[PDB]
Structures are given as C-alpha cells and as structure tokens.
Structure 1
Amino acid sequence: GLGGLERFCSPGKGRGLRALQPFQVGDLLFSCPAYAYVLTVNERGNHCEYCFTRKEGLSKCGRCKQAFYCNVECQKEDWPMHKLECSPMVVFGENWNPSETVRLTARILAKQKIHPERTPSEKLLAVKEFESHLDKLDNEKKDLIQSDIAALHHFYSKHLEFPDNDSLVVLFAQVNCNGFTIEDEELSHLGSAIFPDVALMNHSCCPNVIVTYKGTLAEVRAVQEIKPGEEVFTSYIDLLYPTEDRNDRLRDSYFFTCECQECTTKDKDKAKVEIRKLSDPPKAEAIRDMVRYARNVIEEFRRAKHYKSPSELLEICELSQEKMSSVFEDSNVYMLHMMYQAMGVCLYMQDWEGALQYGQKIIKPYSKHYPLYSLNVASMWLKLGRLYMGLEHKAAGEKALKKAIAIMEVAHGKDHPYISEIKQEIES
C-alpha cells in the first residue's frame, strides 16, 4: 500500500490515494492484509475460519465443534480471534447470535489489545482515523448502535475489556461505514473485514480500480490505465443504477454526493432507464411514477426475501415486470434487477433450467450496463457456465466459463485460485 503510490489531499473529496507510477489494466497496485475479519456463520462448514480457503473435509475445532480449519497452523493462528467465541458458543449454544458487525467489532477490540501499534494494513490510514459520521447519524442508527453495544457486552463479556460507551459508539459507527464484505466467485457473502489502506481510496462511478479478495487478503487491481499523478478511484456503490439512485446510496451511507463525469453529465441515465419505443411517447409523470414504483418494489422485495416463500417471491418478480413493462424495455436496469432476483429464487429451489432461462435473458444487457471488468458480470457468466456444464451443454458452458475467466484474470490476477478452479471445470 505504498510502492508507486502516495496518500494525498483530493480536492473536494478529502484524503485519498494517488499513483506515482503507471499502471496498466490488470496490474496490482497493492494488497492489504485484513486488520480484522470474520467468516460468516452460514459458510462455516465450507471455508477455513482463518484463511477462508474453500475445500471439502475441513478439520473441526475440538473445543467448540463450530469452527473449521485447514490444519493446526490455521487453528493456532486464528485462536486470538476465535477465543472470543469458542467457549461462548458452547455456553450459549443455539442462543449465540451476535450480528456480523458485533463479531467484527469484537475482533477489532481484541486486535487493539494484542497489536496496539500500526499494522501493515495501516501503512497510509489507521483504523483510529476512520470516519464515523457520528454527528450525521439519525436516531434509528444510533439506537441500532446501542443494541450492538448491548449485544457485544452480552455475548463477549468474559473475553474483552470494554471501553466506555462513547468510544464504542464511535467504533461501531466507524465499522458501519468502513467495513468491507468479502464475497466468493459467485458474489456469495463470505464475511466482513477491515482493510484500512483500501478505505483510503475515494469514490468515482467510473472507477479505475477494483477490489477483490484472495482468502482474507484484499487486492487492488487497475481496470483502466492509470498515469502518474492520477487519483486512484474505487466504487463504493453498485454501478448498475442511474445517477439519482447511486447518489441516494452514497448519501445514505457516507453523506456525500458524487461529482464524477458520469454523475455530472448523466450521459448513461437514458440507456439505463431504457424506455420502450412506443407509438405514443410516454410523459415524464409516467416515467417518474414507474421509477418510483421500481425503486419501491426493489426495496419491498429486499424485505420480502426474509419472510415470503420462493413461489411468492417469483410472483413478485413476475408481477413487477408485468407492470414495469408498460414503460420499460427488458434491458432497463430495474427490469434486470427483478430478473436477477428471480434467477436467485430458482437457484435456491434448485430449478436449474429456470435459473438458466433468466440468466440467458439478463447477461447481454447486464454486461452493457456495467463497466468492462465488473465482478457482477463475471459472477453472472460463471453461474451460466456452471448451469450449462451441469446440463451437458459443453460448448455453451466452456464459452460462459471463459467469459468469466476473461474478467477475473484482470480483476483477480491470472494466478488467482478461482481461475485455476474454473480452468479445471472446463478441463472436465
């Protein structure tokens, strides 16, 4: 997080990261070891707790029987963090339920006790310097923070020395906006982590780098050419959506609005909210009304995922698209969102043919709307590839897997484990 790069003051943005040497597409700018990290509960059996390596036959922790490790080195090395939960899981059993944010924050506190001094993950930005945005948080968020502090005390009281409430409020607020989610090759949620030097990068909607993970190591690779003196920009938000949506998301979490070329011009708003070529052109009240509808349905579906059944979820996706299609083309990003969700439901039901059908409809417009080396696009191709291969559509499967590899070679690097894994899926 230092070679050929420096920390600097980005005008209008704040502290950021600047290139001192050229980078080409695919080049590693830096990697950043996790300051703190946690494997999500639902991936326990499938990944090592320490290093996140996926493989069959992982060795169980003999003390709690809940954690899984590659070997005794992984087990020994994870202990300073694992010790925060090992006995507590035995004590609490099925009542053990700290949120992932609480789990990550407990680790931060343990890390601060064992290694109080600057770590390699903090070459340019320290965890203590993270923005909390505490003065901008509403009462609901502050209430949620108090519930996290209560939970932290409740589940970890035998294993941490707690700072005072005011300090923990700041730390939870910092975790809330600075934590990264680590996702696998299909963008499935693996865990949460703190990558301080990665957190230094400012936001653009035409970013020049992409963040990926090799185990718990964050890696930062160029997705456009970067010249000496140029700022290194990552994206904090999902780039599928139009300018207002993007900025609503930025405002919600980080209390700023973007000033990049995409946001200034809004040149891709029309193509993203692609309107049908009707006989009578629609009127702005009807566009505005359908946009509002779409955004509300997306959000209602987000919640519905927790309590509704799979057939009810598909019905929502189908009905939403039927209503939206008065005004929107199928390549419209809001239509794609719902198809993407319907694809998710099919994969969950193990309806492999139905999932393939949705994926086939998503992929080409989805790829046009995202930047060239989007992990969202790579993930979609990978899912198609695997669906095709399972149904013995070999040529289509090879082709989709190779489209995924093409993106991933740039984003993850050519020697990444995922690529070796996917190349073996083709050679098979």
Structure 2
Amino acid sequence: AEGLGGLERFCSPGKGRGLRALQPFQVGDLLFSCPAYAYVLTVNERGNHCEYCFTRKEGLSKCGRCKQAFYCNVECQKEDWPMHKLECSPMVVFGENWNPSETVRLTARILAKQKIHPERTPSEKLLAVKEFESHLDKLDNEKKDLIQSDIAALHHFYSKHLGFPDNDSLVVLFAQVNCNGFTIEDEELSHLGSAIFPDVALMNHSCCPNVIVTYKGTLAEVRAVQEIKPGEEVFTSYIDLLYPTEDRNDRLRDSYFFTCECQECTTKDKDKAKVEIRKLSDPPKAEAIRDMVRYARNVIEEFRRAKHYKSPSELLEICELSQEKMSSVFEDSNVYMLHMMYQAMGVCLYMQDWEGALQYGQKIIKPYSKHYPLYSLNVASMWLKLGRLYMGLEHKAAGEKALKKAIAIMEVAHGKDHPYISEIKQEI
C-alpha cells in the first residue's frame, strides 16, 4: 500500500485526532504527498517565484494590469486567475494602501475554493477543512481582537467577488487557519508563502518527530526521519527545536493550546546546553541570569515585529547591541545568542556583505548541529548557506564539503530525487 493507503485516521488519547502507520517506514521513505487545498505566495517573493506553481525562475511573465504577479507562462497565469482576480484590481486601486496580512490573503483563497470546488478535494483524503479544529472554547480576547482585525481586513480588500458568511463562522474559519495552517519554505528555509494541507494537518506534535514536511512547489511531502513501525503514531514538529522546554511549551500553549509531554519535554535533557552560562571567576547572581533570559526572550519577540517595518541598518544594530549585552553572561553556544547571530547573518545577506554573513555562519553551525536533532532542516539550510557563501567567495574546497553535508541531510528529508538536491549537485 502507498500514499494514504498505508496510513489511517485514529483517535489519539489526549491529542484528539491523529495519523498512524499500517506498514513499516524506514529513514528517508515517502509516507504520503499532499497537494495544497489553498495557497498564497508572500509579497517579498514576487518576481523570483511563480504565483501558481512556486517554481523559482529568472524572468517570469508579469501580469499586465497590476504588474505584481509573475508566472511561468500563459497556462500558469490563466490557471491562477480565479485566485488572482481577488487581488489584481484592488492592488491598482489601493496601491500603497493595499496591505492585507497573509492570513487574510489565504482565508480568501479558502472561501474561493469552497465556492469553486465545494466537493471533497485530493487534499482532504483523511481530514477535511470543514472538520478542522478551531479551539473556539479556548479562544481569549487577545486572539479574538486579532481575528476581528483580520475579518475587517477581509471585508475591506476581498468583498468585491467573495460572499462572506456570518461573523461567528469567520471567527471559526480564521481560528482553523491559525491552528492547521502551514508556511511553505525553500531549501534555505526562507519564507515563500502560506498554505492549507488538510491530510498533513492530521499529524500531531512531538519534540522527537518521526517525520518531516518538505515542499515540491505547492505539494507537501512527508518523509520519515526515524524508524516507524505499524501501529506507531506519526508525529511532526510544529516549532523550532533549538529553544528549551519552557520556550517550546509557551509557544505550543499560545499557538495550539497544549503542553507537550514527549521524551525531550519530560527529561529536559538538552535545556542545560541550550541556556549555557560562561565559566566566570566573578559570576552574576541566579536572579541576574534569570533577568538576561527574560531580556533575550523579549529581544527575540521585539525583533520579530520590528523585522516587518524597521530598516536593515536599524535591525543589524539591535542584533549587535543584544549580542554585546548577552555575551557578558551567555556563551557563544547559547541558543539566545545563536538567534541574534542567525538574524545578523540574515541582515548581512540582504546587505550583500558575504564576509560578514560567513563570519556568523561559521560560529552558528557547530552549536546548531549539537542542539538540533538528526536530519534537521535548520542544520541542512545552515550548511547550504555556508557552502553557497564559500563557493561565491571562491573558497571552493570549503563549499564542496558544506554542500555535501547539506545533501546528506536533504537526501532523507527531501528525497534523493528532489529538484533542490539536483541544483546543489550542479553547484559542486
């Protein structure tokens, strides 16, 4: 049996619904593939990727009216039109004032797909969009205010062609988009867009995941990173595994209303190395260390919101200033130091400072390999960033070693026949 035939929908105790294997799955094996029910490309990736198939290309056929949407050919342009029509005219009319969030952009595509294709889609083999968990009973004022702001934005930019249901039905739908929604990312883990994969959304969370979700354009591919036996539950990671048990569970309680009780969460085995303190002769107080963790956590959240409006020169300054204050107590291997080093590397890449970005990457990779589990995409993308930075700076010996190390992880996660692997092999 293959695809969703060798797997089944079942009730996981204390987790609601879940997916379990009916056949053995080895490391690297493709469990199932799921096409996108609805998908949307991020504004910052326009001109680099096709709006319909997400294929990265140089020189795409741009839209005549708006000149914002880019396509492979007339076929990609015509096929994306039922979804693009909701944005083409408003982009010309509103101009700089056209600013709907990616959540609003995607929810509009779901409402359009629910109209065009009301019957069951190939994306809904085991779980349907109408059957999705919303956590309406658990929703607080903070979330309801954000959902209401999104509903108001949906009415402001998409009410020309889309007939909306009652406010309470939209509250449930937006909550379902947050609970079951995915973000399509490339080989370098750069944000490409947002999508809905109902069959993939059936899998529960674990900090020790047995599977990984990679993308082949708009198609999500689920591959094993651990040995799965028949009857075993299929688990994926909903969050970045670099952070300790506290930081991990605070995000899971805030975004998905649950507390993870897996092996890494129970034992808290990696927490010590993650929040590593320097070996000082005159160390700060236990309360002073707690203050720096609080500062670092607030600096990460402030950078998250500042990223979308502040200039790269300002963003690089917060990365540098935070690192200097944290470096007085925290080690270079510390996860809070690594985040600001990663963000500074990202800023350096936008500013096209290759030597600057390489300096950070060389300090990030060794603690990254230690903190992250085996076959992690964050480690794979870091080797991929280093390799491409070494190759570009004519250090072809160091590049070849890093790109091969990225391939070694990606052959299990993306599969040996993935187009990304073929590109990296051609770069060598």
- TM-score class, shorter-chain normalisation, is over 0.9
SS in 1 for 2:199: helix
User: CA, structure 1 residues 306+42, in 2 after alignment: closer, same or farther (shift >3 Å)?
Assistant: closer
User: CA, structure 1 residues 316+158, in 2 after alignment: closer, same or farther (shift >3 Å)?
Assistant: closer
Question: How big is the shift at 1:78?
Answer: 1.4
Question: How big is the shift at 1:283?
Answer: 5.0
Question: How big is the shift at 1:248?
Answer: 0.2
The number of aligned residues is: 426
Question: How big is the shift at 1:305?
Answer: 3.0
Q: 2:382 matched to which residue of 1?
A: 380
Question: How big is the shift at 1:309?
Answer: 4.1
Q: Distance in 2 between matches of 1:307 and 1:89?
A: 20
Question: How big is the shift at 1:244?
Answer: 0.4
Q: Distance in 2 between matches of 1:280 and 1:93?
A: 58
Question: How big is the shift at 1:387?
Answer: 0.8
Q: 1:233 matched to which residue of 2?
A: 235
User: CA, structure 1 residues 286+162, in 2 after alignment: closer, same or farther (shift >3 Å)?
Assistant: same
User: CA, structure 1 residues 307+163, in 2 after alignment: closer, same or farther (shift >3 Å)?
Assistant: closer
Higher mean C-alpha displacement, 245-254 vs 54-63: 54-63
Higher mean C-alpha displacement, 253-262 vs 291-300: 291-300
Q: 1:345 matched to which residue of 2?
A: 347
User: CA, structure 1 residues 171+301, in 2 after alignment: closer, same or farther (shift >3 Å)?
Assistant: same
User: CA, structure 1 residues 99+314, in 2 after alignment: closer, same or farther (shift >3 Å)?
Assistant: closer
Question: How big is the shift at 1:3?
Answer: 2.0
Q: Per-residue CA shift, 1:111-147, capped at 9, x if unaligned?
A: 0011111111111111011111223222232122122
Q: Distance in 2 between matches of 1:307 and 1:54?
A: 26
Question: How big is the shift at 1:95?
Answer: 2.8
Higher mean C-alpha displacement, 29-38 vs 415-424: 415-424
Q: Per-residue CA shift, 1:371-419, capped at 9, x if unaligned?
A: 1111111111111111111110000111111111111111111111111
User: CA, structure 1 residues 396+37, in 2 after alignment: closer, same or farther (shift >3 Å)?
Assistant: same
Q: Per-residue CA shift, 1:169-225, capped at 9, x if unaligned?
A: 111111122110101111111110000011110000010111011000000000111
Q: Distance in 2 between matches of 1:309 and 1:120?
A: 43
User: CA, structure 1 residues 107+307, in 2 after alignment: closer, same or farther (shift >3 Å)?
Assistant: closer
Q: Per-residue CA shift, 1:19-62, capped at 9, x if unaligned?
A: 11111111110110000001112212111111000111211223
Q: Per-residue CA shift, 1:328-371, capped at 9, x if unaligned?
A: 22111111111111111211211110110000011111111111
User: CA, structure 1 residues 20+274, in 2 after alignment: closer, same or farther (shift >3 Å)?
Assistant: same
User: CA, structure 1 residues 71+312, in 2 after alignment: closer, same or farther (shift >3 Å)?
Assistant: closer
Identity of aligned pairs, percent?
A: 100
User: CA, structure 1 residues 78+310, in 2 after alignment: closer, same or farther (shift >3 Å)?
Assistant: closer
User: CA, structure 1 residues 164+319, in 2 after alignment: closer, same or farther (shift >3 Å)?
Assistant: same
Q: 2:31 matched to which residue of 1?
A: 29
Q: Distance in 2 between matches of 1:386 and 1:173?
A: 39
SS in 2 for 1:38: strand
**Which one of 249, 252, 263 corresponds to residue 251 of structure 2?**
249
Higher mean C-alpha displacement, 286-295 vs 50-59: 286-295
Q: Per-residue CA shift, 1:245-268, capped at 9, x if unaligned?
A: 000000110111001011011111
Question: How big is the shift at 1:318?
Answer: 2.7
Q: Distance in 2 between matches of 1:387 and 1:170?
A: 45
CA RMSD of aligned residues (A): 1.6
SS in 1 for 2:161: coil
User: CA, structure 1 residues 388+292, in 2 after alignment: closer, same or farther (shift >3 Å)?
Assistant: same
Higher mean C-alpha displacement, 306-315 vs 393-402: 306-315
Higher mean C-alpha displacement, 72-81 vs 4-13: 72-81
Q: Distance in 2 between matches of 1:388 and 1:189?
A: 23
Question: How big is the shift at 1:232?
Answer: 0.6
Higher mean C-alpha displacement, 45-54 vs 158-167: 158-167
Higher mean C-alpha displacement, 324-333 vs 222-231: 324-333
User: CA, structure 1 residues 298+63, in 2 after alignment: closer, same or farther (shift >3 Å)?
Assistant: closer
Higher mean C-alpha displacement, 77-86 vs 357-366: 77-86
Q: Distance in 2 between matches of 1:154 and 1:269?
A: 45
Q: Distance in 2 between matches of 1:30 and 1:68?
A: 30
SS in 2 for 1:55: coil
Structure 1 runs of 4+ off > 6 angstroms? none
User: CA, structure 1 residues 77+14, in 2 after alignment: closer, same or farther (shift >3 Å)?
Assistant: same
Question: How big is the shift at 1:69?
Answer: 1.3
Q: Per-residue CA shift, 1:144-183, capped at 9, x if unaligned?
A: 2122112212211221111111111111111122110101
Unmatched segments (≥5 aa) in structure 1: none
What is the TM-score of this pair, normalised by structure 2? 0.95
Higher mean C-alpha displacement, 342-351 vs 204-213: 342-351
User: CA, structure 1 residues 281+267, in 2 after alignment: closer, same or farther (shift >3 Å)?
Assistant: farther
Q: Distance in 2 between matches of 1:358 and 1:425?
A: 22
User: CA, structure 1 residues 320+95, in 2 after alignment: closer, same or farther (shift >3 Å)?
Assistant: closer
Unmatched segments (≥5 aa) in structure 2: none
Higher mean C-alpha displacement, 8-17 vs 64-73: 64-73
Q: 2:138 matched to which residue of 1?
A: 136
Q: Distance in 2 between matches of 1:140 and 1:261?
A: 32
SS in 2 for 1:54: coil
Question: How big is the shift at 1:280?
Answer: 6.1
Q: Distance in 2 between matches of 1:92 and 1:289?
A: 45
User: CA, structure 1 residues 93+318, in 2 after alignment: closer, same or farther (shift >3 Å)?
Assistant: closer
User: CA, structure 1 residues 91+325, in 2 after alignment: closer, same or farther (shift >3 Å)?
Assistant: closer
User: CA, structure 1 residues 156+310, in 2 after alignment: closer, same or farther (shift >3 Å)?
Assistant: closer
Q: Distance in 1 between matches of 2:405 and 2:109?
A: 38
Higher mean C-alpha displacement, 142-151 vs 194-203: 142-151
Please state if 1:330 is matched with 2:332.
Answer: yes
Q: Distance in 1 between matches of 2:158 and 2:303?
A: 34
SS in 2 for 1:196: coil
Q: Distance in 1 between matches of 2:72 and 2:139?
A: 41
What is the TM-score of this pair, normalised by structure 1? 0.95
Q: Distance in 2 between matches of 1:151 and 1:306?
A: 18
User: CA, structure 1 residues 302+64, in 2 after alignment: closer, same or farther (shift >3 Å)?
Assistant: closer
SS in 2 for 1:77: helix
Question: How big is the shift at 1:5?
Answer: 0.6
Q: Distance in 1 between matches of 2:366 and 2:178?
A: 34
Q: Distance in 2 between matches of 1:364 and 1:265?
A: 23
Question: How big is the shift at 1:306?
Answer: 4.0
Query: Aligned ranges for residues 223-372 of structure 1 at < 5 Å?
Result: 223-279=225-281, 283-372=285-374
